[PDB]
């Protein structure tokens, strides 16, 4: 019955009236389309998306109905809904300069879905597409920081340094603007992970040691960060900085808790 | 003079040189096909941010559809064959010719009221609320741009309204009058550039 | 329609980035210090060593091209050729 939905949308596009009545009728049509299933529901939602991006439909009507559509979709499982996500992302280009909140939400949802299916490469590609720099929505610093952090974390398991290095660069650029302490802790953890990954085992050990003496971080997470610091220090280039880091790490008792306690004991006590 | 802002003038003229070079190369581009239409008669220019100042804030207003297509084509070209630099959109400058239609008189819109004319192309008989809600339109500069077509108009009115009054209202409907008396096929409304006295604010800030 | 747009005379502004992840004089990176400073600590005071941007948009550490202008000669890319248009990335 997708043809009937498309015909109703086409007839309502040429209808004249108040914004509230048209919005209500379109919302009812969208709800009817959602009640469908399978290819019929897919085609009905595709027609709804095509109508929303159409020039004739009002700006407020289009943006609000796309928002409601994007809110209803996560209820439908990880399926052809992803195909219509791609279709809608490609569709938004004549009005991609007016509203981007819907585009950002679609990109975030698609990145989450790709992360669910062990796909960091495609999630990274999708989430890169966000226009954070523009400022035409003027996203708050926290949202841009979270987006760049998510891209950097995705790229770490997709194994592609160049772009994640630049993304960490930009996340640091906008980092000294944000407020949230937990977000800052997560950013520092991700930055230490990046340092550990590239070649910066000594700098990663320094960052992990700095993060180890924290309170809000979970005791298990604190122990994991300290273990990462210890392993980076062992794997670091053996020099004065590594010797100082080994001496510093020979003080924590939760270092003694770890299984590599003996290892750095051998390292620092000389053998 | 020496070299303090003579380099500013150098860059200013460099911008015009690059603009005309881009104009001729783009003419060669549309000479070789062009796929779809919408690029009927366009004049896009390339100016740098280091020689032309922003003015106030680098605004983020909307763009009419044919201008949207033109800007998209120019951005694609500049990111394809002039890569290594990205464009920034601003709303202060430009002009356009609006072909209206007993004769067909072509109007002139200075990049600000053409968004209102876009909303009218979709469907006219709008109001101030319609053009202030679905446009992301700026402040009273919008009022000056809008009053150009209706307020203070001689007998060549092209955007008439039912509530005939001097001050601007909110719930007022716009219409169109053919106005055969306007035999001029390139009639323009030059309400902007009323004076050039450099009002104190900008003088003080640059001082 | 009753109104149709025929021409347009827009002005398009552009910004210069050429973002890269490498340096020239210290051969390390765009950020993360240079040869003359090595580590982050040891009398940095919030790391007084940033990225310098020229009028041509080339990017180096401020210290790097500063010593380049100071040590070898000042004539190559002097105040007439190389400007100082920005400080920091
Ligand atoms: Zn440096
Ligand atoms: Zn230093
Ligand atoms: Zn410079």
XYZ file of C-alpha atoms and ligand atoms in Angstrom:
570
model
C 0.000 0.000 0.000
C 3.021 2.254 -0.492
C 1.482 3.615 -3.703
C -1.515 4.893 -1.732
C 0.813 6.572 0.777
C 2.773 8.221 -2.043
C -0.449 9.425 -3.684
C -1.670 10.849 -0.367
C 1.658 12.639 0.104
C 1.495 14.074 -3.422
C -2.076 15.282 -2.876
C -1.180 16.825 0.494
C 1.805 18.617 -1.062
C -0.531 20.639 -3.309
C -2.993 21.294 -0.463
C -3.307 24.751 1.087
C -3.963 25.375 4.760
C -2.504 26.118 8.152
C 0.875 24.681 9.105
C -0.479 22.784 12.125
C -3.163 20.926 10.151
C -0.731 19.959 7.384
C 1.817 18.804 9.968
C -0.816 16.694 11.717
C -2.006 15.110 8.472
C 1.578 14.345 7.435
C 2.289 12.869 10.876
C -0.773 10.633 10.527
C 0.449 9.534 7.087
C 3.892 8.780 8.539
C 2.339 6.763 11.376
C 0.292 4.788 8.844
C 3.455 4.123 6.827
C 5.305 2.947 9.949
C 2.466 0.527 10.736
C 3.357 -1.273 7.492
C 6.135 -3.855 7.240
C 8.639 -5.162 4.726
C 9.073 -3.731 1.246
C 5.765 -1.855 1.485
C 6.942 -0.012 4.602
C 10.342 0.575 2.990
C 8.786 2.176 -0.095
C 6.304 4.192 1.981
C 9.113 5.620 4.116
C 11.173 6.299 0.978
C 8.242 8.260 -0.459
C 7.898 10.122 2.847
C 11.595 11.049 2.761
C 11.319 12.160 -0.873
C 8.324 14.340 0.005
C 10.086 15.888 3.012
C 13.143 16.922 0.962
C 10.874 18.272 -1.791
C 11.003 22.031 -2.359
C 7.240 22.551 -2.012
C 6.994 21.200 1.552
C 7.535 23.792 4.291
C 10.875 24.126 6.077
C 9.399 23.622 9.565
C 7.203 20.781 8.324
C 10.128 19.047 6.610
C 12.572 19.386 9.508
C 10.096 18.322 12.195
C 8.757 15.347 10.239
C 12.281 14.180 9.417
C 13.090 14.471 13.129
C 10.049 12.360 14.030
C 10.910 9.851 11.286
C 14.466 9.561 12.617
C 13.094 9.035 16.131
C 10.715 6.280 14.997
C 13.328 4.328 12.976
C 15.517 2.983 15.862
C 12.458 0.960 16.855
C 12.701 -0.868 13.534
C 15.627 -3.339 13.709
C 19.041 -3.176 12.011
C 17.784 -3.921 8.506
C 16.744 -2.209 5.243
C 16.230 0.771 7.555
C 20.003 1.141 7.124
C 19.482 1.254 3.350
C 16.917 4.028 3.780
C 19.418 5.735 6.098
C 21.881 5.790 3.195
C 19.105 6.945 0.852
C 18.151 9.811 3.177
C 21.787 10.814 3.716
C 22.233 11.024 -0.057
C 18.876 12.800 -0.382
C 19.770 15.731 1.886
C 21.765 18.043 -0.381
C 19.517 20.917 -1.583
C 18.523 21.621 2.037
C 21.740 20.367 3.656
C 22.625 24.011 4.362
C 19.361 24.777 6.195
C 19.071 21.926 8.720
C 21.850 19.550 9.787
C 20.542 18.299 13.144
C 18.609 15.553 11.354
C 21.684 14.720 9.255
C 23.849 14.581 12.383
C 21.342 12.317 14.150
C 21.165 10.011 11.120
C 24.961 9.823 10.956
C 25.208 9.068 14.683
C 22.567 6.331 14.448
C 24.225 4.790 11.383
C 27.621 4.866 13.107
C 26.118 3.136 16.150
C 24.492 0.483 13.943
C 27.770 -0.139 12.106
C 29.583 -0.379 15.451
C 27.026 -3.017 16.453
C 27.951 -5.199 13.453
C 31.695 -5.079 14.260
C 32.215 -2.469 11.512
C 34.457 0.394 12.620
C 35.675 1.249 9.101
C 32.237 2.100 7.698
C 31.093 3.731 10.950
C 34.190 5.935 10.776
C 33.477 6.811 7.138
C 29.891 7.730 8.030
C 30.773 9.802 11.095
C 33.527 11.704 9.261
C 30.824 13.021 6.935
C 29.417 15.248 9.691
C 30.069 18.983 9.005
C 31.195 19.985 12.492
C 33.350 22.889 11.276
C 30.466 24.706 9.540
C 28.821 26.183 12.644
C 25.578 26.774 10.740
C 23.994 24.704 13.490
C 26.722 25.921 15.887
C 27.066 22.612 17.695
C 28.193 23.062 21.283
C 31.793 22.105 22.024
C 30.687 18.966 23.870
C 28.943 17.493 20.815
C 31.900 18.132 18.501
C 34.271 16.674 21.097
C 32.106 13.560 21.454
C 31.868 13.126 17.677
C 35.623 13.465 17.141
C 36.277 11.120 20.072
C 33.946 8.523 18.562
C 35.639 8.796 15.157
C 39.073 8.472 16.774
C 38.003 5.401 18.760
C 36.455 3.803 15.663
C 39.634 4.435 13.614
C 41.784 2.746 16.323
C 40.137 -0.672 15.648
C 39.836 -0.021 11.874
C 43.642 0.645 12.016
C 44.005 3.879 9.950
C 46.312 6.393 11.777
C 46.558 9.390 9.316
C 42.881 10.420 9.586
C 42.576 9.588 13.298
C 45.762 11.577 13.926
C 44.130 14.591 12.264
C 40.902 13.955 14.201
C 42.803 13.834 17.502
C 44.459 17.081 16.384
C 41.084 18.766 15.865
C 39.649 17.239 19.062
C 42.583 18.783 20.929
C 41.998 22.062 19.064
C 38.423 22.286 20.323
C 39.223 20.422 23.559
C 40.195 23.463 25.621
C 36.668 24.844 25.205
C 34.550 22.062 26.716
C 33.223 21.639 30.260
C 32.292 18.025 31.087
C 34.854 16.351 33.356
C 33.882 12.791 32.405
C 34.136 13.704 28.720
C 37.603 15.142 29.383
C 38.617 11.914 31.145
C 37.359 9.869 28.191
C 39.268 12.134 25.798
C 42.465 11.734 27.819
C 42.019 7.948 27.825
C 41.523 7.938 24.049
C 44.537 10.220 23.545
C 46.691 7.900 25.657
C 45.413 4.984 23.566
C 46.401 6.844 20.385
C 49.863 7.552 21.807
C 50.263 3.877 22.721
C 49.166 2.878 19.226
C 51.328 5.119 17.056
C 54.861 4.827 18.466
C 54.486 7.026 21.534
C 54.761 4.352 24.218
C 56.617 6.704 26.574
C 54.073 9.505 26.123
C 51.223 7.004 26.454
C 52.781 5.763 29.693
C 53.010 9.356 30.931
C 49.353 10.035 30.093
C 48.178 6.751 31.633
C 50.171 7.455 34.807
C 48.627 10.931 34.993
C 45.153 9.414 34.585
C 45.848 6.619 37.092
C 45.757 8.931 40.123
C 42.148 9.963 39.456
C 38.959 9.416 41.484
C 35.941 9.373 39.155
C 37.620 6.719 37.002
C 36.513 3.238 38.041
C 38.983 1.333 40.222
C 38.956 -1.429 37.611
C 39.442 1.196 34.894
C 42.173 2.868 36.960
C 43.939 -0.488 37.304
C 43.590 -1.098 33.559
C 45.039 2.340 32.779
C 47.946 1.711 35.155
C 48.550 -1.689 33.539
C 48.621 0.037 30.150
C 51.113 2.567 31.539
C 53.300 -0.247 32.871
C 53.226 -2.178 29.593
C 53.996 0.979 27.603
C 56.902 1.781 29.931
C 58.285 -1.734 29.492
C 57.850 -1.479 25.708
C 59.122 2.116 25.592
C 62.528 3.045 24.207
C 64.909 2.354 27.089
C 66.358 5.696 28.136
C 66.346 8.346 30.831
C 62.625 9.053 30.439
C 61.802 5.340 30.579
C 64.028 4.935 33.645
C 62.225 7.797 35.396
C 58.835 6.325 34.479
C 59.918 2.908 35.786
C 61.069 4.509 39.044
C 57.733 6.326 39.353
C 55.755 3.139 38.657
C 57.692 1.296 41.388
C 55.618 3.173 43.985
C 52.003 2.135 43.306
C 50.755 -0.856 45.285
C 48.210 -1.635 42.567
C 51.304 -1.938 40.386
C 52.346 -4.692 42.805
C 48.858 -6.142 42.320
C 49.474 -6.558 38.579
C 51.151 -9.621 37.041
C 53.855 -7.452 35.414
C 54.918 -6.253 38.865
C 57.829 -8.667 38.782
C 58.657 -7.525 35.258
C 59.148 -3.860 36.096
C 60.809 -4.871 39.369
C 63.414 -6.665 37.245
C 63.579 -3.676 34.884
C 64.191 -1.030 37.544
C 66.277 -3.099 39.973
C 68.637 -3.889 37.057
C 69.167 -7.328 35.495
C 53.554 54.848 0.693
C 55.595 51.944 2.067
C 54.416 48.370 2.719
C 51.711 48.166 5.384
C 48.455 48.001 3.418
C 49.873 48.353 -0.089
C 50.122 44.565 0.169
C 46.424 44.641 1.089
C 45.761 46.425 -2.212
C 48.027 43.937 -4.006
C 45.897 41.093 -2.689
C 42.715 43.012 -3.491
C 43.728 43.229 -7.155
C 45.041 39.652 -7.145
C 41.513 38.663 -6.155
C 40.025 40.377 -9.218
C 42.659 38.758 -11.444
C 41.830 35.301 -10.086
C 38.114 36.072 -10.400
C 38.388 36.844 -14.111
C 40.662 33.844 -14.738
C 38.082 31.642 -13.015
C 35.340 33.306 -15.069
C 37.007 32.475 -18.382
C 37.941 28.919 -17.366
C 34.364 28.349 -16.178
C 33.106 29.692 -19.507
C 35.277 27.000 -21.154
C 33.721 24.496 -18.669
C 30.083 25.263 -19.649
C 31.168 25.444 -23.326
C 31.913 21.697 -22.938
C 28.294 20.502 -22.192
C 26.940 21.052 -18.635
C 24.518 18.109 -17.986
C 21.505 19.762 -16.218
C 20.130 23.331 -16.334
C 19.837 25.942 -13.572
C 23.182 27.392 -14.571
C 21.484 29.585 -17.164
C 23.446 32.836 -16.752
C 25.806 32.876 -13.766
C 28.658 35.157 -12.656
C 30.585 33.608 -9.751
C 33.683 35.317 -8.352
C 36.703 34.168 -6.335
C 37.805 36.471 -3.508
C 40.114 35.704 -0.588
C 39.345 36.233 3.100
C 42.704 37.899 3.803
C 42.009 40.874 1.533
C 38.220 41.204 1.720
C 37.064 41.448 5.355
C 34.026 39.615 6.673
C 32.237 42.889 7.663
C 30.540 41.737 10.874
C 30.242 38.015 11.629
C 30.358 35.679 8.570
C 26.566 35.091 8.583
C 24.906 31.738 7.845
C 21.672 32.630 6.053
C 19.915 30.434 3.495
C 20.370 30.430 -0.286
C 17.780 30.445 -3.121
C 17.583 27.289 -5.252
C 19.268 28.424 -8.477
C 21.888 30.230 -6.347
C 22.129 27.009 -4.313
C 22.941 25.035 -7.464
C 25.425 27.683 -8.611
C 27.205 27.688 -5.246
C 27.288 23.880 -5.190
C 28.777 23.746 -8.699
C 31.382 26.382 -7.833
C 32.296 24.588 -4.599
C 32.631 21.256 -6.411
C 34.898 22.847 -9.023
C 37.002 24.624 -6.390
C 37.381 21.410 -4.372
C 38.157 19.383 -7.516
C 40.618 21.517 -9.513
C 41.671 23.966 -6.758
C 42.003 21.509 -3.891
C 43.842 22.373 -0.693
C 41.401 25.097 0.379
C 37.716 25.193 1.303
C 35.137 27.917 0.719
C 33.312 29.837 3.437
C 29.792 31.138 2.857
C 28.858 34.707 3.780
C 25.845 36.972 3.183
C 26.666 40.608 2.444
C 27.332 41.092 -1.273
C 26.128 40.174 -4.741
C 23.197 40.858 -7.032
C 20.817 39.013 -9.352
C 18.231 39.633 -12.073
C 14.686 38.410 -11.413
C 12.702 37.653 -14.582
C 9.105 38.561 -13.723
C 5.961 38.538 -15.850
C 1.342 42.835 -20.261
C 5.111 42.405 -20.613
C 8.010 40.535 -18.993
C 10.066 42.949 -16.887
C 13.219 41.547 -15.275
C 13.806 42.698 -11.693
C 16.965 43.007 -9.580
C 17.556 41.389 -6.178
C 20.673 42.040 -4.076
C 21.193 38.597 -2.537
C 18.940 39.357 0.439
C 15.336 39.605 -0.779
C 15.901 36.772 -3.266
C 15.300 34.296 -0.432
C 11.870 35.886 0.024
C 11.420 35.601 -3.737
C 12.387 31.920 -3.450
C 9.637 31.405 -0.874
C 7.333 33.248 -3.287
C 8.418 31.069 -6.224
C 7.393 28.068 -4.149
C 4.139 29.832 -3.193
C 3.446 33.564 -2.773
C 0.763 35.276 -0.645
C 3.054 34.778 2.349
C 3.604 37.136 5.283
C 6.413 38.430 7.481
C 6.109 35.373 9.735
C 6.452 33.039 6.742
C 9.638 34.763 5.540
C 11.087 35.041 9.065
C 10.371 31.452 10.190
C 11.309 29.289 7.173
C 14.334 31.316 6.024
C 16.875 31.694 8.881
C 16.859 35.341 7.839
C 18.930 38.095 9.537
C 17.865 41.229 11.429
C 16.564 44.658 10.303
C 18.731 44.508 7.180
C 15.972 42.084 6.190
C 13.453 44.877 6.798
C 15.380 47.273 4.550
C 15.691 44.610 1.843
C 11.984 43.722 2.033
C 10.670 47.300 2.061
C 12.517 47.835 -1.236
C 9.838 46.027 -3.271
C 6.807 47.426 -1.398
C 7.569 50.506 0.721
C 8.439 53.784 -0.973
C 7.733 52.460 -4.458
C 6.814 54.528 -7.532
C 4.255 53.357 -10.095
C 6.314 50.279 -11.019
C 5.360 48.181 -7.991
C 6.204 44.487 -8.346
C 5.391 43.254 -4.818
C 2.118 44.812 -3.661
C 0.279 44.264 -0.387
C -3.288 44.710 0.823
C -2.488 46.553 4.109
C -1.217 49.728 2.431
C 0.802 51.483 5.137
C 4.210 53.025 5.742
C 5.306 51.009 8.778
C 5.837 47.262 8.431
C 3.359 44.832 10.008
C 3.511 41.073 10.667
C 0.305 39.599 9.231
C 0.297 41.252 5.796
C -0.118 39.458 2.465
C 2.053 40.080 -0.605
C 0.788 39.987 -4.195
C 2.078 40.934 -7.653
C 1.018 43.663 -10.081
C 1.975 43.452 -13.750
C 2.361 47.246 -14.027
C 2.607 47.634 -17.810
C 3.831 51.198 -17.195
C 7.167 49.586 -16.233
C 8.327 49.188 -19.824
C 11.925 48.913 -18.561
C 13.020 45.275 -18.909
C 15.865 45.754 -16.409
C 14.148 47.770 -13.681
C 16.179 47.754 -10.465
C 15.385 48.738 -6.884
C 18.451 50.506 -5.477
C 17.259 51.134 -1.940
C 20.688 50.049 -0.657
C 23.695 52.399 -0.884
C 21.570 55.334 0.256
C 24.616 57.050 1.781
C 28.395 56.629 2.037
C 29.109 58.708 5.142
C 30.771 55.876 7.091
C 28.560 55.889 10.236
C 30.592 56.266 13.495
C 30.623 52.560 14.561
C 32.897 51.308 11.776
C 35.073 54.423 11.963
C 35.615 53.915 15.697
C 36.294 50.188 15.405
C 38.871 50.640 12.648
C 40.434 53.544 14.555
C 5.669 30.886 -11.593
C 5.242 34.639 -11.153
C 8.913 35.362 -10.347
C 11.949 33.539 -11.752
C 15.623 34.182 -11.001
C 17.714 34.680 -14.150
C 21.210 35.833 -13.131
C 23.411 35.886 -10.039
C 26.534 37.837 -9.073
C 27.591 36.109 -5.863
C 30.871 36.611 -4.010
C 32.444 33.404 -2.679
C 35.043 33.571 0.089
C 37.545 30.810 0.828
C 39.944 29.861 3.621
C 43.380 28.270 3.483
C 44.172 25.109 5.441
C 46.370 22.601 3.523
C 46.264 20.510 6.705
C 49.143 18.026 6.910
C 50.812 15.942 9.645
C 54.520 16.695 9.200
C 57.138 19.416 9.676
C 60.138 20.621 7.670
C 62.926 21.975 9.894
C 62.599 19.569 12.837
C 61.232 16.633 10.777
C 58.835 15.564 13.530
C 55.206 16.627 13.015
C 52.958 19.671 12.749
C 52.470 19.470 16.531
C 54.120 17.489 19.364
C 57.144 19.762 19.741
C 60.326 20.070 17.674
C 64.052 19.285 17.794
C 64.932 22.310 19.968
C 62.443 21.367 22.709
C 61.967 17.546 22.627
C 59.790 16.831 25.664
C 56.687 18.653 26.913
C 58.071 19.411 30.409
C 61.386 21.045 31.505
C 60.503 24.765 31.654
C 57.738 25.027 29.063
C 55.144 27.038 31.043
C 52.142 25.643 29.126
C 54.466 24.791 26.230
C 55.376 28.170 24.721
C 55.994 26.626 21.286
C 53.158 26.877 18.756
C 52.599 26.565 15.007
C 53.361 29.534 12.749
C 51.313 30.142 9.594
C 52.547 32.155 6.623
C 50.762 34.225 4.004
C 51.341 31.325 1.579
C 49.642 28.994 4.132
C 52.779 26.917 4.728
C 52.923 25.590 8.283
C 55.899 25.114 10.595
C 56.638 25.320 14.280
C 57.158 28.945 15.286
C 60.587 28.118 16.720
C 61.591 26.168 13.597
C 61.088 28.885 10.980
C 62.103 31.523 13.534
C 65.577 29.994 13.828
C 65.505 29.439 10.056
C 65.075 33.191 9.609
C 67.686 33.876 12.309
C 70.486 31.327 11.942
C 71.396 30.738 8.286
C 70.235 34.019 6.716
C 67.323 36.435 6.870
C 67.122 37.127 3.107
C 65.454 33.794 2.137
C 61.724 34.365 2.660
C 62.247 37.715 4.371
C 59.568 40.102 5.652
C 58.699 40.811 1.996
C 58.156 37.158 1.005
C 57.247 35.341 4.240
C 54.662 36.970 6.505
C 53.321 36.052 9.961
C 49.564 35.678 9.490
C 48.701 33.333 12.376
C 50.027 31.739 15.558
C 48.882 28.242 16.473
C 47.027 25.575 14.540
Zn 58.161 22.966 16.765
Zn 59.858 22.934 24.292
Zn 54.545 32.887 7.943
